[PDB]
Amino acid sequence: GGQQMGRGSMHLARFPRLSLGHFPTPLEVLPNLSAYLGGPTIYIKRDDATGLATGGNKTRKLEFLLADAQQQGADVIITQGATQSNHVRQTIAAAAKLGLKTKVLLEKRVEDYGEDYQRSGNVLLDNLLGGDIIDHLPAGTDMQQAMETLAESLRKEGFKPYVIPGGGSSPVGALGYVACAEELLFQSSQQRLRIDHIVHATGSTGTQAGLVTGLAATHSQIPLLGISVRAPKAKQEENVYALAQRTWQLLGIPGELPRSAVRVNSDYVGKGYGIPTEGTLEALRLLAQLEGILLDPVYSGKGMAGLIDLIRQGHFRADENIVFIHTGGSAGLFGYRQLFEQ
Amino acid sequence: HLARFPRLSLGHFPTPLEVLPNLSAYLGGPTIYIKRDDATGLATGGNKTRKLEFLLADAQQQGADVIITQGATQSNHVRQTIAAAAKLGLKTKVLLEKRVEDYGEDYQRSGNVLLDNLLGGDIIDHLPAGTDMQQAMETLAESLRKEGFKPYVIPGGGSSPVGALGYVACAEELLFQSSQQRLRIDHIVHATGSTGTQAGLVTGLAATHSQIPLLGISVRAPKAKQEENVYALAQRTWQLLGIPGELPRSAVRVNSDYVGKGYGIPTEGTLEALRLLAQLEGILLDPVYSGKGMAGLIDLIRQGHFRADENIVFIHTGGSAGLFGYRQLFEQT
Numbered sequence: 207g208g209q210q211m212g213r214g215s216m217h218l219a220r221f222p223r224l225s226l227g228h229f230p231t232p233l234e235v236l237p238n239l240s241a242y243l244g245g246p247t248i249y250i251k252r253d254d255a256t257g258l259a260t261g262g263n264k265t266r267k268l269e270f271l272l273a274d275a276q277q278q279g280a281d282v283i284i285t286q287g288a289t290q291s292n293h294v295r296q297t298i299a300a301a302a303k304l305g306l307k308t309k310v311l312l313e314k315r316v317e318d319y320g321e322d323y324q325r326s327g328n329v330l331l332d333n334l335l336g337g338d339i340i341d342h343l344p345a346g347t348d349m350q351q352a353m354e355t356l357a358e359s360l361r362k363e364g365f366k367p368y369v370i371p372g373g374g375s376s377p378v379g380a381l382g383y384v385a386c387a388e389e390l391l392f393q394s395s396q397q398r399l400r401i402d403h404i405v406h407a408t409g410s411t412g413t414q415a416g417l418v419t420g421l422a423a424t425h426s427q428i429p430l431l432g433i434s435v436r437a438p439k440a441k442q443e444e445n446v447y448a449l450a451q452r453t454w455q456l457l458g459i460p461g462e463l464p465r466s467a468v469r470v471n472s473d474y475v476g477k478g479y480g481i482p483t484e485g486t487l488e489a490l491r492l493l494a495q496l497e498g499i500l501l502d503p504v505y506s507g508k509g510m511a512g513l514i515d516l517i518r519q520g521h522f523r524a525d526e527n528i529v530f531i532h533t534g535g536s537a538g539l540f541g542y543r544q545l546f547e548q
Numbered sequence: 549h550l551a552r553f554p555r556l557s558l559g560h561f562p563t564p565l566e567v568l569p570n571l572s573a574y575l576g577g578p579t580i581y582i583k584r585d586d587a588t589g590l591a592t593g594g595n596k597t598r599k600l601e602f603l604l605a606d607a608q609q610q611g612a613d614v615i616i617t618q619g620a621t622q623s624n625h626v627r628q629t630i631a632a633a634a635k636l637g638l639k640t641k642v643l644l645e646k647r648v649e650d651y652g653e654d655y656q657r658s659g660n661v662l663l664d665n666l667l668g669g670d671i672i673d674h675l676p677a678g679t680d681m682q683q684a685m686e687t688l689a690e691s692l693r694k695e696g697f698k699p700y701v702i703p704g705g706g707s708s709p710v711g712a713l714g715y716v717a718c719a720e721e722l723l724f725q726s727s728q729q730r731l732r733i734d735h736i737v738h739a740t741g742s743t744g745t746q747a748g749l750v751t752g753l754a755a756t757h758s759q760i761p762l763l764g765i766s767v768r769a770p771k772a773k774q775e776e777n778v779y780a781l782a783q784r785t786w787q788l789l790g791i792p793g794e795l796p797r798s799a800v801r802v803n804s805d806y807v808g809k810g811y812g813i814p815t816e817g818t819l820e821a822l823r824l825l826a827q828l829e830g831i832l833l834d835p836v837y838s839g840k841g842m843a844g845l846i847d848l849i850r851q852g853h854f855r856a857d858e859n860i861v862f863i864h865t866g867g868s869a870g871l872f873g874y875r876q877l878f879e880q881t
Contacts, residue, residue, distance in 0.1 A: 539666070
């Protein structure tokens with residue numbers, strides 16, 4: 207009864223926002239997957255279909271980040287990511303639409319899987335889209351510090367740079383998923399759908415931080431579960447909360463976000479970032495062969511593997527409805543060809 | 549009046565119709581709008597999704613229990629057919645034609661092939677170039693009927709009259725958008741291949757007396773052969789709907805100046821079109837189909853074939869998954 211749809215939107219109204227993707231994304235049922243698992247009814251939110259260089263969740267963040275860049279009058283964009291980063295590909299594409307170049311620092315987090323990982327996938331797309339890959343740094347490099355040194359160098363040359371953090375996960379970027387929460391609330395109300403759980407893959411933290419902020423701000427009752435793609439449970443929850451609280455302050459919402467709203471499950475990380483497990487690969491095959499939907503072996507694939515295992519362990523009732531947010535990532539499949547061919 | 553025909557929900561329609569202000573200013577001619585049929589949402593999308601919404605609905609009404617189709621190695625139609633059939637809990641039996649044998653291991657194993665395998669396609673055979681693929685399919689279908697199957701054979705590119713109904717619907721969709729958006733459409737241009745997209749658009753634009761010129765940029769066949777084929781399919785699609793009168797032959801126009809060396813072989817202008825669209829608009833074309841379509845649009849604007857006050861709608865038909873099949877060519881520049 208106390209639900210307050212539009213409260214988030216009213217705080218978002220004072221922030222600039224560029225139209226870069228195709229919104230709202232569809233919210234649709236997965237009937238073959240739901241029958242195969244024999245548990246709750248599974249719905250998918252298609253944030254893979256944002257329309258920006260094969261789409262993805264990073265597109266929502268970029269609509270706020272690049273509006274803010276344009277507001278500052280930036281004339282070059284800087285960001286960073288792992289070799290096969292989706293954020294990097296979408297940032298370059300988005301910046302090209304706005305007529306701006308993008309300088310990129312890539313991090314060699316993963317060096318397995320041969321030449322296809324090095325040169326296909328998101329790397330091929332980065333090149334076609336005209337990204338300026340300034341350096342490939344070793345795993346473990348302070349990537350944020352390297353971007354700030356680059357930014358200062360370009361400033362001395364006369365540029366006005368805007369630095370976008372890894373995954374776009376600043377409080378401004380998290381506003382994109384505050385907006386998604388409101389879009390998911392209206393969508394499901396219009397479809398007469400009662401959402402009992404939201405599940406998605408959580409990484410640099412902006413997607414979960416924005417969703418948690420939007421859901422708490424509208425007094426929605428919907429529990430949200432992040433499936434970690436890298437960090438352990440306690441570390442990921444602390445970073446999500448910290449960013450979500452910084453986003454709560456940016457929106458100017460009084461008080462504090464409930465800490466019990468941040469929940470992560472890290473049982474599906476496997477050996478580390480960008481390393482799929484055999485459960486990751488099954489999730490990809492199940493979603494492609496039962497639903498014609500393409501996941502990815504780094505992010506959405508681990509998020510779905512988490513969901514499939516939770517259903518199989520009996521965590522949900524048949525009359526419950528689960529929303530899986532498809533966060534995208536299909537372009538990365540091609541960097542993983544050596545592993546698929548085994 | 550397409551509700552008389554069965555239609556399944558496979559894609560996300562209507563697709564956006566957006567202006568491209570960077571490309572339009574760079575070329576200095578008319579205003580270019582892009583219809584985003586690369587964003588149908590079916591296994592990275594594409595024009596083939598529109599056809600399959602009617603092909604697989606008709607197949608369901610006939611009680612089909614297995615789909616058969618065919619295409620070249622990097623066929624976008626094969627990928628989308630496997631994905632669409634998977635949604636119905638149907639398997640797909642695929643024959644591939646080895647039209648192109650350049651571009652190395654990525655062409656053979658990446659791109660649409662990687663997707664075809666992940667989506668569970670059953671590639672029955674890799675046939676040599678020039679094979680009568682429709683006859684190969686009919687032999688497979690008859691062989692499956694003896695095993696008790698009820699197969700539904702989809703022709704190459706989904707370009708039967710039923711499939712072309714997909715772009716008759718797109719024509720109505722485009723008219724409504726430009727009407728609400730208050731946009732005068734002066735020309736429509738798109739890459740034309742197996743003929744279904746153009747035959748459907750011509751039949752829709754003509755049945756409503758829209759008077760919008762349509763140009764198909766061929767990806768393979770020469771002009772006269774392609775116009776003959778589009779016109780024949782558009783006529784059967786005209787009769788399938790019961791439209792009064794008959795379809796005018798002057799409505800079918802094709803330009804085949806951008807085929808280059810043949811199917812799946814991009815020219816230097818094809819690759820320039822891919823770079824311009826990616827760097828000016830963040831939009832990914834493909835070197836087989838939509839990139840050749842855009843190379844033709846770019847070249848005709850440079851020839852002053854259009855005035856600045858005209859509005860061009862380019863239908864982005866998709867194909868970006870095939871970019872990965874062409875990595876080795878990209879890595880030469």
